[PDB]
Amino acid sequence: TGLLDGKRILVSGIITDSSIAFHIARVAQEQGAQLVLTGFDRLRLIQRITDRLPAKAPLLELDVQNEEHLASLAGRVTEAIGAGNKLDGVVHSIGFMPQTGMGINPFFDAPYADVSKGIHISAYSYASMAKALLPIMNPGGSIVGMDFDPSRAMPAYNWMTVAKSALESVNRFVAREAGKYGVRSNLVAAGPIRTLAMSAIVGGALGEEAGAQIQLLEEGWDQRAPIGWNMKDATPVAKTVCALLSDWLPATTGDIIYADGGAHTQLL
Amino acid sequence: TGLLDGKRILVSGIITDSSIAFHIARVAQEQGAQLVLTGFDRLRLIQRITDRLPAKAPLLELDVQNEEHLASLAGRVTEAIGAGNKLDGVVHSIGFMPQTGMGINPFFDAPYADVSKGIHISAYSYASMAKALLPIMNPGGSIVGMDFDPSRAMPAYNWMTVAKSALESVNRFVAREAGKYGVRSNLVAAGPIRTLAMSAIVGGALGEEAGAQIQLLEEGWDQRAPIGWNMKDATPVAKTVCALLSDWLPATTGDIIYADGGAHTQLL
Amino acid sequence: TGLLDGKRILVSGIITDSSIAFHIARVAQEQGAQLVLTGFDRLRLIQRITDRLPAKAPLLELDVQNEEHLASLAGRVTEAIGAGNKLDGVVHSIGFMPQTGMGINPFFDAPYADVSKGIHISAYSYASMAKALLPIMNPGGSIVGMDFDPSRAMPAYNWMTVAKSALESVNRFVAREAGKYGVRSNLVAAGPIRTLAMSAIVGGALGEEAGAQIQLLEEGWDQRAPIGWNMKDATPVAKTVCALLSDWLPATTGDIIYADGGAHTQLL
Amino acid sequence: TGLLDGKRILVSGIITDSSIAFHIARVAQEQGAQLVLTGFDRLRLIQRITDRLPAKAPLLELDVQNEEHLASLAGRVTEAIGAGNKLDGVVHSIGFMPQTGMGINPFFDAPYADVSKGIHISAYSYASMAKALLPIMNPGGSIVGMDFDPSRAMPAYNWMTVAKSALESVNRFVAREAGKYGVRSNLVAAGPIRTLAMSAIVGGALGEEAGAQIQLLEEGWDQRAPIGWNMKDATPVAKTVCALLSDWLPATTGDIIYADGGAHTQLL
């Protein structure tokens, strides 16, 4: 068996072994999937990381902001998996926001050029990935994106939060197009995970106050979550992502699935 | 393997072979679960129905409004699966609303004695079942209830919609308690299903106007659903319930999963 | 002038001079309305209290759970305001929940008889009041109920939280009926107010610990609220209720207006 | 008295006498406000229109995408109202989206430069206007933006819908900053209004299919609205906007008020 047995799935956004995408790709492999990986800048460095995965997988360059990479991508992808074969799953684990639009810089001081870049990479990218890949997706297929609940404003995240609100709106439209191909589109809203950017600020990068704000945020999460929340374990969210890649949520699309320990359902 | 291989799961609310509980129980067994069933009032009939299931399973009587059935329940359940064994999953598929509070009788004309019965059975029962069964559930366990999205008012459902609002709220509180035992609690919001009662009313059992109302509702669902909606196929919801009973949504609780074809995400 | 100049408005749920309803009635009178008050059980005491209001007003008995009181109510109101006169506004500020379903008693230990009583008074009452009063309301009118945001579970409120979810759902159905008369129906979701029950529990009543859970809830409100929150000042909510009774939210119905200082929009 | 008596309020986004901003400004003046208007391109043309307003009001140029205009804005505003005077209200009624991101062009075919332009004007501008204006606003003041409900995907609106999700997110962050000055920030989510562009598309300017999409949308709104919805009457949304500019929603911020006839609360 295996939840994802003989499914060909693309996974983007692995940069380190702490990346959420990394564990997705691992659990997918643990579970009988056959992957195709995308990388962004330091591929040789990335390639170095993905070797640590339980199975080998093709690594492709994908700068989401490059139109040519996008146009060429399905071709480049089909070559890697064999003609007369298509993808069954796609995972979008891509995000970025300049420190001017996130962290300690005041909310009003973020220049739209920085914000437009963050939105380009964090929201629009979900459609442009979906536009590129849907022609080579099999009916019954699934696209999963990574969300962080933006329904209420929170202190540090600022413009990333605004970007996530847009991504949520975008997923809904993508589900409309994806429907034509019999493909589902959903976001997983994860609670906070100790990935390097998160790890950097809890470590004290950018000051002690910002790290205590974040720890206050992390503390509140595990508190509110009736089954707790472990910033250090990215596996429960990866299992959730795989569930949406599987055939076990066949009637769910344009939706958001909350992998946060139930934090978002409790006030305190 | 089976998604629920060697999982011990209780399933309530089977009254006919069209009942959602029936397809839940069926898909569960297909996927390696070992079930215990509860039924209300017409036991002889229910047992007769459960024989059509892929495996034999114990049938226990449970009128949720009967306190004795509730107190005895954990005892009676343990007897059925062997001492030193506990439940891994529990499914609440129970709903009821008097015609005075649902269908064609005007909203203002439902007597609270009737409404109180509908809420007792459709919302409160969810807590009283979890109170009875949590002491005999294993950590890692899951409780799933059945929801019908009450976030907006709809024409016929009336007080059942109100009952569902209450159930959603109850699910959130149950999750707090279930968390102590390492148990998740969630609802599946299904789109409309052609169960006997639905087939009855679309057929004209409640008048010409009410049967046209349902078809109008169903057509709209399937239109809005980017992946369509088939009132006659209860399987995608039973798979969804099974996904939550599995170990693949480990970080989700107090929450609602929409198995509605994505209807709720589209305006039109 | 006056925002509510020469509008005839009924106001319920006055029991002390700390009652939100009391400030509603006060600000209403300040704003040129002519009121009719309903009171429950301690009529003589209420009358003693309503004398402290800036204007005289008829006081009518209304135990929402008494069918006789409801049927007689429309008659009794017109009698009090003169035949050929109709109500322009109605205010529902009524709630009740037994301590078995609220406070320190565990969630699972509330007997449905107690919960059913709480729902009867806090949710259903909203409907049975609209049913009584709509026939004698003028087009352009407003029915306002009092809400406490139940979208997430919180520690002490328990079954009152569940009751508020139900009331919300009820408001949506009531708007459908009220629409036929050209009448709006809405809830104000207020933040916590140091009303007598709140005053009792912050006082070491029910333990130091339950009061500390509550103070954490109260503190957090003022923290999260971008304009802060003053538990001792009920005036901002009475103003909000008056805004909905006015002709200045004419296209808003079946909705919830949050007078919480914006707390519900911020995570922390 | 007038709801907005002797309040100094800035109003942007007037381009025609059908513009929502126009009725806002009209009802604001009717209600005792002293306005300051902003215009964007066709200033000479706008002045001709604003002459049709019940009172004269200074017209200032403001291209939201021009930083210089933003920086100069507070100065230019203070000149118009007298030094030592500040604003009590600000209205953001600004939106724009290229036909590539809205209407008949497929969702996947919108170029990010066009999308980025739309979000710039429709979402970011709400922040950049507030940054410019908060220093010269009196405590107790109010900022209102115009929303169109993006919580569910709809056929034509596409990237404008995405922009509004972002704008909602932004409103929440702006209220945190606005709070320091004792100022509220809120959006009014309006149902569809027959402004020239809407009338245009209904006429067939974007094809037969798109004009039928809109009427189908408008028809559904008035059905669902328990109090109906008149696409041709913008006064109820302008009345709503004025209510938020008043001192009658003092405990509401970072929030959204729905002036939609209650459509969003009904399923059908």
Ligand SMILES: NC(=O)c1ccc[n+]([C@@H]2O[C@H](COP(=O)([O-])OP(=O)(O)OC[C@H]3O[C@@H](n4cnc5c(N)ncnc54)[C@H](O)[C@@H]3O)[C@@H](O)[C@H]2O)c1
């Ligand atoms: N980190 C968290 O606490 C957490 C929580 C909620 C949601 N998320 C979301 O999950 C995703 C992954 O999170 P993470 O913490 O693992 O982040 P990460 O830092 O590990 O990965 C972010 C990824 O974005 C990719 N990326 C940036 N620009 C790109 C571009 N131009 N083209 C292609 N790829 C590009 C990088 O390759 C990187 O792998 C993000 O989108 C994030 O918004 C993360």
Ligand SMILES: NC(=O)c1ccc[n+]([C@@H]2O[C@H](COP(=O)([O-])OP(=O)(O)OC[C@H]3O[C@@H](n4cnc5c(N)ncnc54)[C@H](O)[C@@H]3O)[C@@H](O)[C@H]2O)c1
């Ligand atoms: N079909 C739909 O449109 C739909 C959609 C969403 C959710 N649901 C929900 O699914 C669940 C079952 O729906 P269904 O379509 O299978 O209906 P069904 O009639 O087949 O099952 C309803 C069950 O409730 C049980 N019940 C009634 N009173 C009881 C009592 N006092 N004690 C124990 N059980 C009692 C009945 O025995 C019956 O098995 C309900 O919770 C319903 O609210 C149905």
Ligand SMILES: NC(=O)c1ccc[n+]([C@@H]2O[C@H](COP(=O)([O-])OP(=O)(O)OC[C@H]3O[C@@H](n4cnc5c(N)ncnc54)[C@H](O)[C@@H]3O)[C@@H](O)[C@H]2O)c1
């Ligand atoms: N006080 C708060 O912190 C708060 C916050 C949010 C919402 N609310 C809601 O506002 C309303 C009033 O709040 P409050 O704090 O002023 O409470 P309160 O105790 O001062 O008033 C509640 C009222 O309900 C009335 N009541 C109880 N049972 C009744 C029945 N059988 N028939 C008629 N009236 C009955 C009482 O006479 C009393 O006037 C309640 O519905 C409550 O749920 C209160």
Ligand SMILES: NC(=O)c1ccc[n+]([C@@H]2O[C@H](COP(=O)([O-])OP(=O)(O)OC[C@H]3O[C@@H](n4cnc5c(N)ncnc54)[C@H](O)[C@@H]3O)[C@@H](O)[C@H]2O)c1
């Ligand atoms: N009309 C509707 O059906 C509808 C519904 C809900 C909300 N809204 C919102 O109401 C607001 C105005 O709507 P409308 O229907 O009056 O539109 P409109 O075309 O009449 O006004 C839009 C205004 O935005 C201004 N504008 C555009 N780009 C600008 C820029 N770069 N800098 C400065 N100003 C700029 C224009 O000058 C124009 O006056 C928009 O924000 C829209 O999102 C419209």
Ligand SMILES: Cc1ccn([C@@H](C)c2nnc(Nc3ccn(Cc4c(F)cccc4Cl)n3)s2)n1
């Ligand atoms: C949400 C979500 C959670 C983690 N991420 C990844 C994919 C990112 N994308 N852009 C990023 N840039 C920035 C800018 C500033 N910081 C560090 C930072 C912060 F200031 C505030 C909160 C959290 C974090 Cl970590 N990071 S970090 N995204």
Ligand SMILES: Cc1ccn([C@@H](C)c2nnc(Nc3ccn(Cc4c(F)cccc4Cl)n3)s2)n1
């Ligand atoms: C939700 C959900 C959807 C179907 N159900 C099952 C469990 C029910 N339980 N009580 C019910 N009472 C009533 C009262 C009247 N009717 C028939 C009826 C109706 F008038 C309107 C819509 C559907 C149905 Cl069938 N049914 S229907 N629950």
Ligand SMILES: Cc1ccn([C@@H](C)c2nnc(Nc3ccn(Cc4c(F)cccc4Cl)n3)s2)n1
């Ligand atoms: C919401 C809302 C906010 C205040 N109320 C009024 C109308 C009420 N009606 N019945 C009530 N019962 C009970 C039962 C126990 N307590 C006191 C109590 C508590 F233990 C925990 C939290 C708050 C409060 Cl006060 N109160 S409190 N309702």
Ligand SMILES: Cc1ccn([C@@H](C)c2nnc(Nc3ccn(Cc4c(F)cccc4Cl)n3)s2)n1
């Ligand atoms: C929401 C909301 C409602 C009307 N608007 C104004 C302020 C706008 N700003 N940019 C706009 N671009 C576009 C792009 C295409 N169309 C015409 C058009 C359409 F294809 C679909 C629906 C309505 C309209 Cl009119 N208009 S329309 N915004």
